[PDB]
Structures are given as structure tokens and as C-alpha cells.
RNA sequence: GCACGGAGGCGAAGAACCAUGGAUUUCCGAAUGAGAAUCUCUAACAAUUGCUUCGCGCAAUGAGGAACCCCGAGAACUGAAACAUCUCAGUAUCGGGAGGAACAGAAAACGCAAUGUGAUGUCGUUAGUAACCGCGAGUGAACGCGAUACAGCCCAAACC
RNA sequence: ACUCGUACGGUCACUGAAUCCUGCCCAGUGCAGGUAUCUGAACACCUCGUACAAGAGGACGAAGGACCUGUCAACGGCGGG
RNA sequence: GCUUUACUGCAGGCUGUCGCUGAGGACUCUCACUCCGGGAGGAGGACACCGAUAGCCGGGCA
């Protein structure tokens, strides 16, 4: 496909969000990203 | 039931529309102030997709290039005239009043200046019979005596392409190609061959219209099928 | 003594006789060639307009509107209906044509508010009404003792809520006693049975 | 037009307006179709002017007949703003009435005469 | 900040925090210079109107809001032990529109008929009464009265 | 819409290349035409009725029907003695 | 769901009548209105279209 600049920004955001919950948050909250996505198993919007 | 094919037509969806975007032009007579001071030169002969007959491209004195409904016998180079004082020769257009009785004419106007409505099909022609100061009588291709304003313009000669109907299509494929150039849904499935839900004649073990085919003029759409207001049927009597 | 106005009034009691008859025969030819809503600088029936609140002042507008004559332009049912709900021809709308006229006029002038309207005749296929509209934002009106009331917020789009004189009549609010049990204070509060 | 049954020559009209101008400066005149109408009804009018470019025509359609059944003479003016200007107004006037002229009676009288003649 | 980490920092120049007011406030969005799946192309009240210095100069409209409210459009399942009038119901749903509430409202009223009442909502009652109805199933007020709250005015014309 | 189309057209149907052929039936039904006479609604008109109105009746009578004709490559039919 | 000379209705077509609609059981005209024409003007014309209503037909539809 051909992605517009805006589509690109959105894909970029989705990529960023798709990360682990920082280790330090674990400690601070004394004990998981529910929005973790996989390119294959999942399907983004658009 | 469901609307019959005849009713689907009316909606004007693509399936039933003519390929207008592929049609060339509407061979309507030129409009002249008066005098007949209009003459052009046949620059070319073309095929008219909407009528399966030839058309003549003409270049008039005043610089107007337009396609014209050509009669039989017009060729490149030839000079055509349009106006009251036009010379009485094949390919020329002028008001009936100027045409001599007994002359085959084509592309006859219904109302003076409308561009031509009658006898435009392949090889046909209207026959100018009676003249007058109030009414010109023409015998149209169907054999009907038509009363027209002597001011209705017309072209001398019969329409080009005569005899087109003498040769059989021989194969479905040929019919196919021609139908693709018209506003028509083809092929045709017989009503008796459809389900009751789809046509007045549908249904039944064996195929047959479980009813008389001669339908009344007052019948509503959806029911007006078969022989519409027939004055008679068959070949007998 | 009689006002000049009384004469315009008296002429319009029989729009089919006298000079007026000849005027209408002439005028209508032009109206028929005009649009749906034509603003006009002066009311065709001065007496009537002034009587309804019209004033020769800034912010006061008059427009003639034409509407097709006849009953409801309704489409026949495309689903199951008991005989009672299959009608199409003899069914008429609940709003009279003058009301439809006032609404089209008001849509044309979004910033104005309908004041009143009156009839100016009809031919065989349409009816004409002139509508008086007021500009609630113009100071000449905001300062008018007789019209400033129409500047209040709750008067916005008054015509669309039936607050017009023609609106109130059509809603059955004329009578204060017998027969208005289901019209007052509103058709809706009375279950829509009026 | 529907109320106009005869055309008044540009010249006759010229004199009338002049008579009206001197009328307001000298005698008395009414400005406006309503005041004009009451004058004819009260009989306090000698000569009434009626523009021809009045739209809608209903505003003045009644003047002609109301005057005839009052013996009051009337005349038509082509423009509407001239009658108003001649009447001394900063606007127009669909109708006007000379309520007893002034140092113009002779002329006002002749104008009326010339009218009856013009049928 | 949620959030109980590490590091670092701020706070007596009175921070944090709270209240009120102000500043900043990207792009799309009624979305309004044109176009576009939130971007792009070359000065913008686009569009419809009012006024008009007739120039977008001054203004209005547009869209939103839980329901409530006003004006229009308007079913069927269902009940009648079938079903068509009737019923479900002017309900569901649809179009348009206003406000903090709407709508109504100072009698061409009522008609306990009177030597009587006196704008209008609403509440209690009048009453499942009068009235309607394959006179079937069902539908169904009002005047009055007791209350709540109370408020009465402005034009058109005559004459100027 | 058909249609930049105009009877050598295009709409509605039936049959289903070529070849040899395609009989009889118009009573019923359908369609169409005609029709002296009969029948045939509302408005207007007339009489009765009502100081008005409801209403009763009359006169006139369109399409339609009665009646007549055409038509089966129109629905269909071609038996018993 | 489908059918029809089932019941009851609804569109639709035909037809009369009233309005649009004018002048002098048959007639002329022009001015509304309609159509042709780029225009002038031509054709038609109180009809037709349209609104209302009445009778007939009306498994096309409920
Ligand atoms: Cl073909
Ligand atoms: Cl409004
Ligand atoms: Cl009382
Ligand atoms: K039901
Ligand atoms: Mg990564
Ligand atoms: Mg052509
Ligand atoms: Mg094709
Ligand atoms: Mg076939
Ligand atoms: Mg099959
Ligand atoms: Mg069927
Ligand atoms: Mg068969
Ligand atoms: Mg005052
Ligand atoms: Mg309420
Ligand atoms: Mg934008
Ligand atoms: Mg039941
Ligand atoms: Mg009901
Ligand atoms: Mg029962
Ligand atoms: Mg009820
Ligand atoms: Mg009561
Ligand atoms: Mg077969
Ligand atoms: Mg086969
Ligand atoms: Mg046209
Ligand atoms: Mg059925
Ligand atoms: Na994926
Ligand atoms: Na408005
Ligand atoms: Na009601
Ligand atoms: Na902010
Ligand atoms: Na704005
Ligand atoms: Na501007
Ligand atoms: Na039951
Ligand atoms: Na049942
Ligand atoms: Na019932
Ligand atoms: Na037969
Ligand atoms: Na089924
Ligand atoms: Sr997969
Ligand atoms: Sr053409
Ligand atoms: Sr043309
Ligand atoms: Sr069949
Ligand atoms: Sr035969
Ligand atoms: Sr609004
Ligand atoms: Sr003026
Ligand atoms: Sr009170
Ligand atoms: Sr064969
Ligand atoms: Sr027969």
C-alpha cells in the first residue's frame, strides 16, 4: 500500500504504544500492558 | 410479487441505459436566419454508433463543422445547401414548402425548426405528396399520411444504409454486438419461463400463460404484458 | 372619515371583481415566473400588513412565497398495512399551506423571525402568501415599542414551533372554551389528539 | 395603469406641479394617499394629484372613482418622486391634494379645465 | 498526580494545595478561502440573510446538550381468544425547533340558567360520570369545586 | 430511462436453425370496434319537503355494461350418441 | 411465499363534473395557459396540463 503522512503518524504512535510497562513502574506500584499488539495476530484501524 | 423487467427499465440504471458517452452527435438541421446563404462541403463519411448507418461530416462556409444525417448518394467533396433557396438536389435541406410534390424526403421536422424527427432510420424516407399554403402532406415510412406545417424543414433523398435489415444476424454473437450499442437489455427470457413471482405468465407445471395475453389499455404497469390492447391477433381472418 | 387603507381592504374582499381582478390576472403572470421566495419592497395588501404589525422601518421585511396547491404528496406504503392505513390519495397534511409558506420564507432568511403572513391569491396550481419578517438584531427594531418583543431569545425560530398567528389557529387554539379541550395548552401535552 | 384612463401631456403635467409648488408656499396642500383621501371625502380638496408609478396599484386605485363621485378634479403625474418633490417632500408621494390653492387658483382652475377636455 | 522506584530538583524570595480572575491553548471538528480518512494548496464570515458608508464595513444563522418542551411525519407485533371498523397508539421510530424550563394566557369564555363565575398552566376531585363503539372488545372528556400561584397589558383604525 | 433514438425504429409477448408444413372452432373468457334502443354517478337544473337545511323524487346521461361485429401464431377447445 | 371470477381495500388507467378560465347543442376569437423557435415569431387555446370529486376497470399492490 501507500501510506499518507498522517497514516504514518498514526502507525508510528501505535508502534510506540506497543511497548512494555517500564520496570520502575513495577516497583513503585509494588506489582502489564493491556494494549500490547502483534502485527500478525492483531489488526490496527484504517 | 417482484417488479417485472419492464418496471426495472424505468429506473434508468446502467444496465438499461444507452452508451451515450460513445455516441457522436444529434444530426439536427442547422439554424439559418434566412436567405439560404448557407452551403458546406462534405469533408468525410463516418459510422454513426447510435444508428448503424453512415453520417456525413460537413464544413459550412461560415466555418461550422458538424455531422449531418446523410441520405444515400452523398460523398466527400460534394457540396450541400441549407435554406429556403437551396437547390433541389439530394443532400440539401429546405422547408417542405420549397420541395416539389412527389419527392422522397428524410429527417423531416415535426415542428418547424426542431431539427428533424421523422424518417431518420436506415434506408427509409417520407414521401412529400400534397402542397399548400397551410399544410404539407407527407406519407411517412409506416404508410401514415402526416399533416405538417409547410415550414417544417427536410432533406431530399432517402436515408443512407438501406437494406441493412435484409441480412440475417445468423448468430447470437452478432445480435450481441449490436445490442451493446443500444439502450437495451438483451437477451430475452420469456415470461412463461419465469417463476410466478416474477411475471404474470410465470409458474405452472408446463410453461403457458395461464391467462389470455390480450391485455387492456387501462392495465397498470406490472400487469400490462403480452399483447397490449390488441385490436386482433393471429394471421387468420 | 374612511382611511385610504379601508379601500385596499374592501378591494380584497372580492379579488375576483373590479380593478383588482384585472390586477391579479396581470400580476400572476409575473409571479409564475418568479421563484419560491421573492423579497418585495412593499406589501401588496398594505392595510392587511399594517394591521398585522407591519411598519415602514429598517429591519422589517416582506417576501412573497408560492406553494403547490392540493393535498398531501404522499408515497404509498411499502410494507404491510391494515386497509385503514393504506390510503394515499385523499390524505391531507395537518399543516395548512399558509404555514408551509411561512416556514419556507423563514428558511430563506435564517436571521429573521416570522411576524405574520397573509394571502395574496392563487391560480389553479399554486397559492401565494406574503410574509412579514423582522430583524431582531437591528437597533431600529430593538428600540421599537411595538416590535422589540420579538427580539427575545425564546422567539427564535418561532414559526417552526407554531408560535405564529397562523400557527396558533392551525393548532386549534382559537376557542377559549368548548372544543379546545385537546388543543390548549399544546397538542403534544394532550397526547396529540386535537 | 388599471386606474389610469388617459395620458396627461408632459407639458400639462409641468404646469400642475408648478401650481402645486406655489400651492404649498401660498395656499394649502395635503401629502400622502391617506390625507389626500380624507380631503376628497371631506370635500376640502380642489385638485388631487396621483402618481402613475405606484406599486402596488391598490394604494391609489380608489382615487379616480372617489373623486368623480365628489366632483373633485384629479390629474396623473408620470413620476412618484416628482409629486413628492413638488409637494415639498424629501421622499415620494403616491398622491397629493391641493386643499385650497393660493395665488395659483387661476392656473389650478385652468389645469382642471384642460383635464375635463382631455376626457 | 494515579504510582509505596532510582536519580535529580523545588520550597522561608513562603513551594505543595484550594478559591477567584487572567495567560498560553497544535490539527481535525458547525468547520466557514479551496481541497483532503486529522493533511495539503494559493488571502478568505464558505453558504443564506439583515443593515448598508453598497466595501464582508457592521451584524445574524449553522453545531452541541441526560432528559424535559413545542411544531410536523407516523407503524406493526398485540387485544377483540379468527378478523376488516375498533385496539395496541398518536405509542415506537423519523423530520424541524426553542429554553432553563417550554407551551398557554387577559373571553366573539362559561351556561352548577344565574340578582351567578371572571386570563392561563398545574394538582386533587368531578368520573370510568357524559360521550364514543362489529353498541362487541374496548376508548373516554368538560363545566364546576378544593388547592397552588396570581397580573395585567400593547397594536390596526378613527383624529393629528 | 428508453433517447446524441424516430417505423430498415423500439417497446410488449409467444415460438425456437434449415427443410415440408401449420386444419376446424369467436359459444364461454380476454382484447378491440360499433351501437337505434335499454341501463349508467356526481355537480348544475326542476318538483315536493324545510320561513333555511337534512331528505324524497324527476329530467339530462360520460366511460362502462346490455346488444352487434372483428380476432385463435388470444386464453383455450376439437366429445358422447 | 405464491394463486385466483375468495373477502375487503389500495395504487394505476379510462370517463363526467368543478376550479384554473377569457371575449364574441353547434360555432368563432385571443388574453390566460401549453408547445416549437437563438430571436422575431409560429402552432395550439380556454382545451390540454394541474388541484378536487364522481362512475367503470383494477391480484399491479396490501
Ligand atoms: Cl435489432
Ligand atoms: Cl421565525
Ligand atoms: Cl360558574
Ligand atoms: K391491526
Ligand atoms: Mg521497536
Ligand atoms: Mg440528431
Ligand atoms: Mg449492454
Ligand atoms: Mg427468449
Ligand atoms: Mg423454473
Ligand atoms: Mg404475479
Ligand atoms: Mg408452451
Ligand atoms: Mg403608542
Ligand atoms: Mg404543558
Ligand atoms: Mg478548513
Ligand atoms: Mg386477535
Ligand atoms: Mg384511532
Ligand atoms: Mg367478537
Ligand atoms: Mg383514545
Ligand atoms: Mg363545559
Ligand atoms: Mg418452448
Ligand atoms: Mg427450449
Ligand atoms: Mg421545452
Ligand atoms: Mg395477496
Ligand atoms: Na495485522
Ligand atoms: Na428565519
Ligand atoms: Na381531533
Ligand atoms: Na485551555
Ligand atoms: Na458569521
Ligand atoms: Na458586504
Ligand atoms: Na386471539
Ligand atoms: Na390469525
Ligand atoms: Na368501532
Ligand atoms: Na370464443
Ligand atoms: Na414461505
Ligand atoms: Sr491471519
Ligand atoms: Sr433531437
Ligand atoms: Sr435542439
Ligand atoms: Sr404460467
Ligand atoms: Sr387461421
Ligand atoms: Sr436556529
Ligand atoms: Sr420612496
Ligand atoms: Sr387572578
Ligand atoms: Sr423450424
Ligand atoms: Sr370472443
mmCIF file of N, CA and C in Angstrom, chain B residues 11 23 26 30 35 57 68 104 107 111 123 125 141 146 161 166 177 214-215 220 224 226 232:
data_model
loop_
_atom_site.group_PDB
_atom_site.id
_atom_site.type_symbol
_atom_site.label_atom_id
_atom_site.label_comp_id
_atom_site.label_asym_id
_atom_site.label_seq_id
_atom_site.Cartn_x
_atom_site.Cartn_y
_atom_site.Cartn_z
ATOM 1 N N UNK B 11 -36.231 2.812 -14.163
ATOM 2 C CA UNK B 11 -35.307 3.438 -13.225
ATOM 3 C C UNK B 11 -34.063 4.015 -13.895
ATOM 4 N N UNK B 23 -21.731 7.948 -28.126
ATOM 5 C CA UNK B 23 -22.455 8.425 -29.289
ATOM 6 C C UNK B 23 -21.775 9.677 -29.836
ATOM 7 N N UNK B 26 -26.113 14.582 -32.567
ATOM 8 C CA UNK B 26 -27.533 14.531 -32.899
ATOM 9 C C UNK B 26 -27.766 15.319 -34.183
ATOM 10 N N UNK B 30 -29.256 22.558 -39.379
ATOM 11 C CA UNK B 30 -28.649 23.813 -38.965
ATOM 12 C C UNK B 30 -29.742 24.863 -38.866
ATOM 13 N N UNK B 35 -32.584 33.445 -46.110
ATOM 14 C CA UNK B 35 -31.800 33.657 -47.308
ATOM 15 C C UNK B 35 -31.277 32.390 -47.949
ATOM 16 N N UNK B 57 -19.714 14.262 -42.397
ATOM 17 C CA UNK B 57 -19.114 15.408 -41.717
ATOM 18 C C UNK B 57 -19.045 16.564 -42.714
ATOM 19 N N UNK B 68 -23.891 15.457 -40.237
ATOM 20 C CA UNK B 68 -25.252 15.565 -40.744
ATOM 21 C C UNK B 68 -25.865 14.211 -41.085
ATOM 22 N N UNK B 104 -39.038 12.184 -52.577
ATOM 23 C CA UNK B 104 -38.680 11.448 -51.356
ATOM 24 C C UNK B 104 -37.802 12.302 -50.451
ATOM 25 N N UNK B 107 -35.524 12.923 -42.597
ATOM 26 C CA UNK B 107 -35.180 13.754 -41.444
ATOM 27 C C UNK B 107 -36.111 14.959 -41.401
ATOM 28 N N UNK B 111 -42.140 19.987 -35.939
ATOM 29 C CA UNK B 111 -42.490 21.377 -35.731
ATOM 30 C C UNK B 111 -41.334 22.213 -36.304
ATOM 31 N N UNK B 123 -32.053 3.558 -44.769
ATOM 32 C CA UNK B 123 -32.814 3.390 -45.995
ATOM 33 C C UNK B 123 -34.260 3.826 -46.092
ATOM 34 N N UNK B 125 -37.546 6.744 -45.901
ATOM 35 C CA UNK B 125 -37.820 8.060 -46.453
ATOM 36 C C UNK B 125 -39.308 8.357 -46.379
ATOM 37 N N UNK B 141 -42.794 6.633 -43.440
ATOM 38 C CA UNK B 141 -42.424 5.236 -43.698
ATOM 39 C C UNK B 141 -43.430 4.180 -43.261
ATOM 40 N N UNK B 146 -49.191 12.109 -42.935
ATOM 41 C CA UNK B 146 -48.960 13.099 -41.895
ATOM 42 C C UNK B 146 -49.159 14.525 -42.391
ATOM 43 N N UNK B 161 -27.662 3.742 -46.033
ATOM 44 C CA UNK B 161 -27.683 2.432 -45.398
ATOM 45 C C UNK B 161 -28.864 1.504 -45.625
ATOM 46 N N UNK B 166 -32.001 -6.650 -44.495
ATOM 47 C CA UNK B 166 -32.157 -7.806 -45.371
ATOM 48 C C UNK B 166 -31.269 -8.992 -45.024
ATOM 49 N N UNK B 177 -23.276 -7.911 -30.279
ATOM 50 C CA UNK B 177 -22.508 -6.710 -30.588
ATOM 51 C C UNK B 177 -23.360 -5.491 -30.906
ATOM 52 N N UNK B 214 -54.033 -10.885 -24.455
ATOM 53 C CA UNK B 214 -54.510 -9.558 -24.841
ATOM 54 C C UNK B 214 -54.908 -8.772 -23.607
ATOM 55 N N UNK B 215 -54.053 -7.847 -23.203
ATOM 56 C CA UNK B 215 -54.296 -7.057 -22.009
ATOM 57 C C UNK B 215 -54.905 -5.696 -22.322
ATOM 58 N N UNK B 220 -52.454 -1.513 -15.183
ATOM 59 C CA UNK B 220 -51.347 -0.825 -14.516
ATOM 60 C C UNK B 220 -49.984 -1.428 -14.867
ATOM 61 N N UNK B 224 -49.420 -4.935 -17.376
ATOM 62 C CA UNK B 224 -49.538 -4.698 -18.801
ATOM 63 C C UNK B 224 -48.416 -5.425 -19.533
ATOM 64 N N UNK B 226 -47.699 -8.996 -22.481
ATOM 65 C CA UNK B 226 -48.352 -9.772 -23.515
ATOM 66 C C UNK B 226 -48.750 -8.858 -24.657
ATOM 67 N N UNK B 232 -56.693 -7.144 -32.617
ATOM 68 C CA UNK B 232 -56.861 -8.507 -33.099
ATOM 69 C C UNK B 232 -55.514 -9.201 -32.951
#
